[PDB]
């Protein structure tokens, strides 16, 4: 017979042109299972493996086994090296400074001026942060709160001043405290009267208790990094480890990154922080110039590059040098401010995670061995793979179940600053006035080095030199992944150039699904993604029109809201079908109300409510857009104080209606002892809501003031009452109570 081969498309169409077909993104992304301790220990072993020939010493602060590769012996092989020479970095930085005159001080200025204005609430926007008070990850906003509450107990009220600087002062000061005290909740039984047989009921009430830790135990927690495994990491067989850092360290990272961003923005070969169309423009413009400026009768070559073991090799002590050089002409306080973040990373400790699980197949028993008790059982117990890891881990292991990790950047939150170090390498351009000239692009670890020279043999001699240069900065170019060819086509950050950056619709296909916000929101997102893809990702009008269809199907199945005229049996469908029969203007019904889809290419950008508003039924629209509907949750006046979440600004355009609902909170918490936190949540939520009731502007714009919340609320209510009396809104009998109640505060 005739045997079909799909790779035979690449005969009729070049790879770059149909690169879409090489991304399997209708498939499931890889997920991890169980523990990340295996993956973590590897990182810890390798990081030190690449630095093992450096200066090993014991930290007289933590007592940890510190390794220092910097200014170390140069490598004798192509295995990853962290042995970066300070002088070579400083020279590279000097060259950069020469060719970009007065950028360092310009950036250092702006960065410094930014810091002064920066408030503490800036730290309440970063997913899950490590909370040292409870030694587990918490939401960023809570991680800060827990630290602020705990800081107050040790007489540290810098956070109250509002700015980030005085709070940061408290963080580095807190290291000097002999013992650090913090609240940790304990439950208490209490008899409470009830219409019970015996006439009472026992209920567990939580109460804050002051726990202490020593100077060292706090420091280690401050320098601690919680570890996980990266889930949904696409285009990779085997899994990798990641890390989240503490609120202490995150305060200082902000400035150093901000500094580096300012520098990056004003660099020619920086892929960050530019993105999307802005990036495509910059790189398209950059490629054109570096293309045309090639010597005639010569060969321009493009090394499609990639740096392996990027985070593992790059050393904090080098990043410390980078700040000191960049902050040359800055005041002494700011030089010292920037220096902290690198210093903390150079003494960082890695938490080993969940540990390892041991089993018996005969007995059918399983048990998790925690990391402190990792060397409790003999190593014959652990599998051959794990056995070796634990042996190699031993000299970096801490008995409380952590690992010393002076080298490397495990957490890696110096994206901008690491990009600068890369760009600095590209800044050299030539070594020993040879017959070549290099210059590239750099987006963190991903790079694309162009080389203009006489012959490809010479080009190679230059690439060899560039390779050898990077090694002096602690940058290891992947020989296995990186490749080279004559200029015209290359790859950079999964953007495929072939005489121009090609379309690659496959990559962002997973965004065409139902977003999972809610009915009203997901519709907008759906049509917006389609709209935006027609523009950017080169989706034609046929595929676009179908993209609507496929979405509407998914939407109708997910939110179980098929067409009213359909006979698809369902629980919600029963009422939908009644709504279909009841309603006259059925073309006005939304899709989620079993209405027909009226979206096409031209009207993707218009809200469905606004599209259909004019052809709705007056009773239907009244129900759909009821201004006191319970699904959304408005304002008001008895005692309405729930755990409200701050209403954000989202890019999608949608109307506030009954379909703009919220889902019930996961109730797993009600079983565990974390139960207690709900009351703490509802306590803050009680205050915030009444504060919002006092100041309606607080919802819209951030209220400012270092004074007390009660103080503010008192005065406003006092004023409101006084004016309400004199105006004639409030009565004498009421005004008596008003001033009386306010008097009690």
């Amino acid at each position: 017979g005739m045997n079909i081969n799909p790779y035979f498309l690449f005969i009729d169409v070049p790879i770059q042109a149909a690169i879409s077909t090489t991304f399997p993104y209708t498939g499931v992304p890889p997920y991890s299972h169980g523990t990340g301790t295996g993956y973590t220990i590897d990182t810890v072993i390798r990081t030190h493996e690449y630095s093992n020939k450096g200066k090993q010493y014991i930290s007289d602060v933590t007592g940890c086994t510190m390794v220092d590769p910097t200014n170390g012996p140069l490598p004798e092989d192509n295995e990853p090296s962290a042995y970066a020479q300070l002088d070579c970095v400083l020279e590279a930085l000097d060259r950069m400074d020469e060719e970009h005159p007065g950028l360092f001080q310009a950036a250092s200025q702006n960065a410094m001026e930014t810091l002064m204005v920066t408030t503490v609430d800036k730290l309440t926007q970063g997913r899950q942060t490590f909370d040292w008070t409870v030694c587990r990850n918490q939401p960023a906003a809570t991680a800060l709160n827990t630290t602020i509450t705990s800081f107050r107990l040790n007489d540290l009220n810098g956070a109250d001043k509002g700015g980030l600087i005085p709070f940061c002062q408290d963080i580095i000061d807190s290291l000097d405290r002999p013992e650090m005290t913090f609240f940790s909740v304990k439950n208490i039984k209490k008899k409470l009267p009830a219409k019970n047989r015996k006439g009472f009921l026992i209920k567990r009430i939580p109460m804050k208790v002051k726990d202490k830790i020593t100077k060292v135990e706090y420091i280690k927690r401050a320098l601690s990094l919680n570890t996980m495994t990266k889930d949904a990491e696409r285009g990779k067989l085997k899994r990798r480890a990641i890390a989240t850092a503490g609120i202490q360290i995150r305060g200082f990272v902000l400035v150093v990154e901000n500094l580096a961003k300012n520098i990056c923005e004003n660099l020619e070969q920086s892929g960050l922080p530019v993105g999307g169309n802005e990036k495509k423009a910059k790189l398209s413009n950059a490629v054109a110039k570096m293309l045309s400026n090639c010597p005639p009768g010569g060969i321009s070559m493009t090394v499609t590059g990639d740096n392996t073991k990027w985070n593992e090799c790059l050393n904090p002590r080098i990043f410390l040098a980078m700040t000191e050089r960049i902050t040359r002409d800055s005041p002494i306080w700011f030089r010292d401010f920037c220096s902290i973040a690198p210093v903390l990373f150079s003494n960082k400790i890695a938490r080993l995670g969940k540990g390892f699980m041991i089993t018996s197949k005969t007995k059918r028993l399983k048990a998790q061995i925690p990391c402190p008790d990792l060397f409790s059982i003999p190593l014959e117990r652990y599998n051959e793979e794990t056995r070796a890891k634990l042996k190699k881990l031993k000299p970096f292991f801490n008995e409380e179940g952590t690992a010393s990790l002076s080298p490397g950047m495990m957490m890696g939150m110096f994206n901008m600053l690491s990009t600068v170090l890369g760009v600095a390498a590209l800044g050299i351009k030539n070594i020993g006035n040879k017959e070549y000239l290099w210059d590239g692009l750099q987006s963190s670890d991903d790079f694309a080095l162009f080389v203009n020279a006489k012959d490809e043999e010479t080009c190679m001699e230059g690439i060899n030199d560039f390779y050898r240069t990077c090694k002096l900065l602690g940058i290891n170019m992947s020989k296995k992944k990186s490749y080279c060819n004559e200029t015209g086509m290359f790859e950079f950050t999964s953007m495929f150039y072939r005489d121009g950056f090609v379309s690659n619709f496959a990559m962002e296909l997973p965004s065409f699904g139902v977003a999972g916000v809610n009915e009203s929101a997901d519709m907008a997102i759906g049509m917006t993604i389609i709209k935006n893809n027609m523009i950017n990702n080169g989706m034609g009008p046929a595929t676009a029109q179908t993209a609507i269809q496929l979405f509407i199907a998914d939407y109708r199945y997910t939110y179980k809201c098929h067409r009213g005229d359909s006979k698809v049996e369902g629980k919600r469908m029963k009422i939908i079908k009644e709504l279909w029969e009841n309603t006259k203007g059925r073309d006005g019904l939304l899709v989620a109300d079993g209405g027909p889809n009226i979206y096409n290419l031209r009207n993707l950008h218009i809200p469905e409510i606004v599209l259909k508003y004019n052809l709705m039924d007056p009773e239907y629209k009244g129900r759909l857009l009821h201004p006191q509907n319970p699904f959304v949750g408005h304002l008001s006046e008895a005692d309405i104080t729930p755990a409200h979440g701050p209403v954000k600004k989202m890019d999608y355009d949608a109307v506030s209606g009954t379909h703009s609902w919220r889902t019930k909170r996961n109730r797993s918490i009600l079983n565990t002892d974390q139960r207690n936190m709900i009351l703490e949540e509802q306590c803050y939520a009680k205050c915030c809501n009444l504060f919002e009731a006092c100041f309606n502007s607080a919802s819209y714009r951030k209220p400012v003031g270092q004074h007390s919340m009660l103080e503010a609320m008192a005065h406003r209510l006092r004023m409101d009452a006084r004016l309400d009396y004199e105006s004639g809104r409030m009565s004498k009998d009421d005004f008596e109570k008003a001033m009386a109640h306010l008097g009690e505060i």
Binding site: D121, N145, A281, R602, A643, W661, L670, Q674, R729
Partner: protein, 733 residues
């Protein structure tokens, strides 16, 4: 009287010592921290979690209220809600069927002022509804990635200015310090506050809606001849890479947006007309059939009072009164005496850097204006000579002085640049230096005046000077004076020059700006071969397509008559994308190679196709008869807008294996239209004019020779040449 309740609820709250201490300790700043305090993790897979949660009995949470209790516990054997209260909302949980119930049999609320609240969106729909669609057209579109406005604003303000304006509307009490901005948008606030007065929608929603139509959403997008927001919002239907759709929005269109788009058209017409013999003929041909959105160009130029040299040239070409009126942002000039000679020079600015700016020579006088304020300005090459001004608004007078000083391009003004100024944006694109300097010094004026100089005030009749404070003063800036006091027939040459009745010229085709920019509105050319005013890559592709189309005829005709078929309308258009200062020499080269194939029999159909378009411009050989030799043929635009002679280029390349020609990333087949003997027939012959292959690389001859070295050979001498990588060829003259 909600006051009473709040005060009493405070007393309820202050009973709890947990709450009491929170209110006492937590500052007003720290509200922003505790508001974001929550228990739960951030849902990493919400698409999944939603799909899963919708299969559960009670996924949604009502808000504890009397309205929630208007929903029944069940309806016709469907559990609509449960008694169990949610952790978050502290209200009864319910099924999705509840929503459907509410929408079917729920209470009917008041929707008064809904269309007023969400006017922004209704306008968006109105623009689509009251629109007109033209024709779809298939053909190459060069999309450029530019930073554009996504949504039409009612009035544009900075975020901070907008935020304060929003505050005045919704939350007057918690406004803070009254800024001058409050007074500036006094009518907007008054208007909006009256329109949103009758409403029962949540103020936080009203806030973000106003923000949507005051704060600018300006983001990078791939555009192609349409920048206007009302066009951008429909960008998905406007064009793709390989097709274009005509679309006319609804409602209104700004006169400024008409103006700037009108300019772009006129420049494009002139830029193409120049290359034709009798440019005026072609200029008129196009201009009459040139439409801007829906309004004809001829009609536009009549209605609009403004525009650059190009506008006036075309105005004259059509037969309309030219306006000598120019604009420089806020400044509006009208020349009376002088002649402008723009010339690119390397200006050193105050901070200590060098920028390439176009400087204007000659003594010139203009009628400067800024709102209520007026004046007369006399300037010279990088120096303000004298400036007379009127007396009106203190701030309007202040602006004109700054504007005029910048417009002058005074060496003093450039030396007063102290701070961060950007002539190149974050995406490494050019920002107009003169317009950037206009924006910079409009803010930091105190630095400008100090770095300028001062002198004695005039002592004339109505002439008395003003100082930094902008009041009558003894000291005044060097060349500043304040006063109490506030059409000729032209003809245009066929070669596009505006000659006066005397003989002196006002304008020429050489005086229009070279810059090609994205039109604000959509420019249509209601003529066949409208592609001619395209971009470089558009013109390049359409030309080579037209060559392939008629390759049967053009190749045959070439073998008969020599220069009969070199003059074609496509190749005329193609010339206008060639640098004029190199066009002549390229034709001298191309024809010489073309004829060399015909005569010596050593043909190459791809190379014929590649070079044929260049053979239009009258040739320009060297002094010794022999043509100029070239490795590449550089064309107008970016460094990738070039053709290669020996190799393939980003615009043009041929694959012999597949017999596939690649023009600007589009793939055409030369199967069938290729000779049999041509396969092994080397390229070395059709690479240098008056040069043919003899053998292969002879190490005795030495290394490969440059263009120069080859041009400086005596006929009969052999040499070594490299076509592409790893293909040496030995060639004689």
């Amino acid at each position: 009287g909600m006051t009473l309740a709040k005060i009493e609820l405070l007393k309820q709250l202050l009973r709890d010592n947990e709450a009491k201490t929170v209110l006492k300790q937590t500052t007003v700043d720290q509200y922003n921290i505790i508001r974001k305090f929550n228990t739960s993790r951030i849902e990493k897979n919400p698409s999944l979690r939603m799909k899963w949660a919708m299969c559960s009995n009670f996924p949604l949470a009502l808000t504890k209220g009397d309205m929630a209790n208007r929903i029944p516990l069940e309806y016709k054997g469907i559990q609509l809600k449960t008694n169990a209260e949610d952790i978050g909302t502290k209200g009864q949980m319910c099924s999705i069927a509840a929503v459907t119930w509410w929408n079917t049999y729920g209470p009917i609320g008041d929707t008064e002022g809904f269309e007023r609240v969400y006017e922004s969106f209704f306008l968006r729909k109105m623009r689509l509804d009251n629109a007109t669609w033209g024709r779809i057209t298939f053909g190459p579109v060069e999309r450029v990635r530019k930073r554009v406005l996504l949504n039409p604003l009612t009035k544009e303000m900075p975020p901070d200015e907008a935020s304060n304006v929003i505050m005045e509307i919704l939350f007057p009490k918690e406004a803070g310090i009254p800024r001058e901005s409050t007074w500036i948008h006094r009518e907007l606030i008054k208007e909006k506050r009256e329109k949103l007065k009758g409403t029962m929608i949540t103020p936080i929603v009203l806030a973000y809606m106003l923000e949507r139509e005051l704060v600018a959403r300006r983001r990078f997008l791939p555009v192609a001849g349409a920048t206007s927001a009302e066009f951008i919002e429909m960008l998905h239907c406007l064009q793709g890479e390989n097709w274009r759709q005509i679309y006319h929005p609804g409602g209104n269109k700004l006169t400024e947006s008409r103006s700037q788009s009108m300019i772009v058209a006129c420049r494009k017409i002139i830029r193409r007309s120049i290359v034709a013999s009798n440019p005026l003929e072609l200029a008129v041909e196009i201009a009459n059939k040139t439409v801007i959105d829906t309004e004809p160009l001829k009609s536009c130029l009549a209605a609009i009072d403004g525009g650059d040299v190009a506008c006036d040239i075309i105005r004259a070409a059509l037969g309309l009164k030219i306006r000598q009126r120019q604009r420089f942002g806020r400044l509006e000039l009208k020349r009376i005496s002088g002649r402008g000679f723009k010339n690119d020079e390397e200006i050193l600015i105050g901070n200590g850097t060098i920028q390439k700016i176009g400087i204007w020579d000659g003594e010139e006088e203009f009628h400067v204006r800024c709102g209520e304020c007026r004046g007369i300005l006399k300037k010279s090459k990088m120096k303000l000579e004298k400036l007379l001004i009127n007396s009106a608004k203190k701030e309007d007078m202040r602006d004109l002085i700054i504007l005029c000083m910048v417009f002058s391009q005074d060496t003093r003004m450039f030396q007063g640049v102290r701070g961060e100024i950007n002539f190149l944006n974050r995406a490494g694109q050019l920002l107009s230096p003169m317009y950037q300097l206009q924006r910079y010094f409009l803010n930091r004026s105190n630095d400008l005046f100090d770095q300028w100089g001062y002198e004695e005030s005039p002592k004339a009749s109505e002439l008395h000077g003003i100082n930094e404070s902008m009041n009558a003063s003894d000291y005044t800036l060097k060349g500043v004076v304040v006063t109490r006091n506030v059409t000729e027939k032209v003809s245009i040459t066929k070669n596009l020059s505006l000659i006066k009745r005397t003989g002196e010229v006002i304008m020429g085709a050489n005086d229009v700006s070279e810059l090609e920019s994205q039109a604000q509105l959509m420019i249509t050319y209601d003529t066949p071969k409208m592609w001619e005013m395209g971009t470089t890559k558009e013109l390049v592709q359409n030309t080579y397509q037209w060559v392939l189309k008629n390759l049967v005829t053009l190749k045959a005709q070439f073998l008969l008559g020599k220069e009969d078929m070199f003059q074609w309308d496509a190749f005329e258009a193609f010339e206008s994308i060639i640098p004029q200062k190199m066009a002549g020499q390229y034709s001298g080269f191309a024809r010489a190679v073309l004829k060399q194939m015909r005569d010596q029999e050593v043909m190459k159909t791809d190379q014929f196709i590649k070079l044929l378009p260049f053979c239009f411009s009258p040739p320009k050989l060297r002094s010794n008869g022999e043509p100029y030799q070239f490795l590449k043929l550089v064309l107008k635009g970016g460094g990738e807008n070039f053709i290669e002679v020996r190799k393939g280029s980003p615009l043009f390349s041929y694959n012999p294996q597949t017999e596939v020609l690649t023009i600007c990333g589009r793939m055409m087949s030369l199967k069938g239209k290729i000779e049999d003997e041509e396969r092994n027939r080397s390229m070395g012959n059709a690479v240098l004019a008056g040069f043919l292959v003899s053998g292969k690389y002879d190490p005795d001859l030495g290394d490969f020779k440059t263009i120069e070295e080859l041009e400086k050979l005596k006929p009969g001498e052999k040499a070594n040449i490299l076509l592409y990588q790893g293909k040496p060829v030995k060639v004689v003259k």
